[PDB]
Ligand binder design. Structure first.
Ligand code: HEM
Ligand SMILES: CC(C)(C)OC(=O)N[C@@H](CS[C@@H](Cc1ccccc1)C(=O)NCCc1cccnc1)Cc1ccccc1
Length: 451
């Protein structure tokens, strides 16, 4: 301190930082609105201070390719550290440098196309659970909360896909597993006082309720020693040129996949149904393609799902509006120059996906929901270093192919059977949480009707 001179030195524009807070008071209207502003106010690059922490925002497609890909293993290997985490330093989204490069390898073959295809039947089962719970609310002409019934499903999928556990978490009951995964303002006080993290690290306060982890650490070694098709198996099988996956390293990834596939796959499905409801022609047009490919509500398979192109367009276009991650970020680990610009050591290099997904200089009518942007006719003109809902380069979303497949299966079954209509209590237009997650302000609630 005071590092508050750095962007002024480098000749990089940005909002003036108050002392000890930097520009955080600017987060009051959400990250996303702060970025769209800085984008319009400052141009292709700009800088700011999460407290003392210089952040440099970059928007050039080459520069972005340079960072996420060309210079990844060398400079931009790790994300910004948050804490305290404790035994979850070892998880892959969190681990650093070579310990990450190791973990990526041991868990890469798990997410192969082939391995995903064998997951299709188990993921097909709980689609049926989802419909039945839906009809129980469709026959009772009462509006529905989507995050609940979708979460009940996303949860249903994770537990089976990662450990084989088989529950109907919605109704079926207080089953021992639905609950420790229920614990599925502290993160703002980290930023003004990140010098407090190692304090908490010697205090073993886990941002994970310290008890859940104790449940799954022990719940894992029960399953481990009961068997001795799912992720736990695919990981136990891996630990049988890199030291093998340890037992706690195994518990920690299981956790990272449950946070991954749960309030992401649940949230996105919600965002997709909202758009399908407020846009009934797209709903019908998709229900058609679904019925032409799967006549008679024929069960989808892995191959039929990669055959629905409109489906893919609705998914991509939605994730254009709602890129759950909002920003991507990497820590610059060394003095570097990229595409003719000095970047000094320690700076956090941030890419604002949300404000690029909503940039008029790359998107005509960017607030509108137009799936045609992703027709095979126009999908080619889309700069891949602007549309990045799963990241890019070696450190992108390892669970990309599974999430897409997981979500697409849900929609197919559900649009085969119901249509979705606004209620008077629907929030139109939907407004994003002014907070710090990509969720709707108010929960998405609609009317479900049976075909
Ligand atoms: C629609 C759902 C999802 C979206 C939009 C999404 C998007 C992302 C993004 C943007 C990142 C960071 C990429 C980067 O920094 O370049 C990421 C990372 C990650 N995702 Fe996903 N993700 C989704 C679901 C999942 C799922 C279902 C899994 C399944 C286990 C998963 C596992 C991971 C992991 C482990 C990382 C960290 C990668 C690493 O550091 O090596 N994600 N995801
Ligand atoms: C801070 C550093 C650089 C050391 O670690 C990260 O920043 N990592 C993430 C931090 S939040 C965290 C939620 C959590 C809650 C409780 C325990 C662990 C984690 C996550 O690890 N979630 C991955 C699954 C997932 C979620 C969404 C999409 N894909 C996978 C942010 C992030 C992850 C992943 C993508 C973008 C940001």
């Amino acid at each position: 301190t005071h590092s508050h001179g750095l962007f002024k030195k480098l000749g990089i524009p940005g909002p003036t930082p108050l002392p000890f807070l930097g520009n955080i008071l600017s987060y009051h209207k959400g990250f996303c609105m702060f970025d769209m502003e800085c984008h319009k106010k400052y141009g292709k690059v700009w800088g700011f201070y999460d407290g003392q922490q210089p952040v440099l925002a970059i928007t050039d497609p080459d520069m972005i390719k340079t960072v996420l890909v060309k210079e990844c293993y060398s400079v931009f290997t790790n994300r910004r550290p948050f804490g305290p985490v404790g035994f979850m330093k070892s998880a892959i989204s969190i681990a650093e440098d070579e310990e990450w490069k190791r973990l990526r390898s041991l868990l890469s073959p798990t997410f192969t196309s082939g391995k995903l295809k064998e997951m299709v039947p188990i993921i097909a089962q709980y689609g049926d659970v989802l419909v039945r719970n839906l009809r129980r609310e469709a026959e009772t002409g009462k509006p529905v909360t989507l995050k609940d019934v979708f979460g009940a499903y996303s949860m249903d999928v994770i537990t089976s896909t990662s450990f084989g556990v088989n529950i109907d978490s919605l109704n079926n009951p207080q089953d021992p597993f639905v609950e420790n995964t229920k614990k599925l303002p502290f993160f703002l006080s980290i930023t003004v006082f990140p010098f407090l993290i190692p304090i908490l690290e010697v205090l073993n306060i886990c941002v994970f309720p310290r008890e859940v982890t104790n449940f799954l650490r022990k719940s894992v070694k029960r399953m481990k020693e009961s068997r001795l098709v799912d992720f736990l198996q695919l990981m136990i099988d891996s630990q049988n040129s890199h030291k093998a996956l340890s037992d706690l390293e195994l518990v920690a990834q299981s956790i990272i996949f449950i946070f991954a596939g749960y309030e992401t796959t649940s949230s996105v499905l919600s965002f997709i149904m909202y758009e399908l409801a407020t846009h009934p022609d797209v709903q019908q047009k998709l229900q058609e393609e679904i019925d032409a490919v799967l006549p008679n509500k024929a069960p989808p398979t892995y191959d039929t799902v990669l055959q629905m192109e409109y489906l893919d367009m609705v998914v991509n276009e939605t994730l254009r509006l709602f890129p759950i991650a909002m920003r991507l970020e990497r820590v610059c680990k060394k003095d570097v120059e990229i595409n003719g610009m000095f970047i000094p050591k320690g700076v956090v290099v941030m890419i604002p996906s949300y404000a690029l997904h909503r940039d008029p200089k790359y998107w005509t009518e960017p607030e509108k929901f137009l799936p045609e942007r992703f027709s095979k006719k126009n999908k080619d003109n889309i700069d891949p270093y602007i549309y990045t809902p799963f990241g890019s380069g070696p450190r992108n979303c390892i669970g990309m192919r599974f999430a897409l497949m997981n979500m697409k299966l849900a929609l197919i079954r559900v649009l085969q059977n119901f249509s979705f209509k606004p209620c008077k209590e629907t929030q139109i237009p939907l407004k994003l949480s002014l907070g710090g997650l990509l969720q709707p302000e108010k929960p998405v609630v609609l009317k479900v009707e049976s075909r």
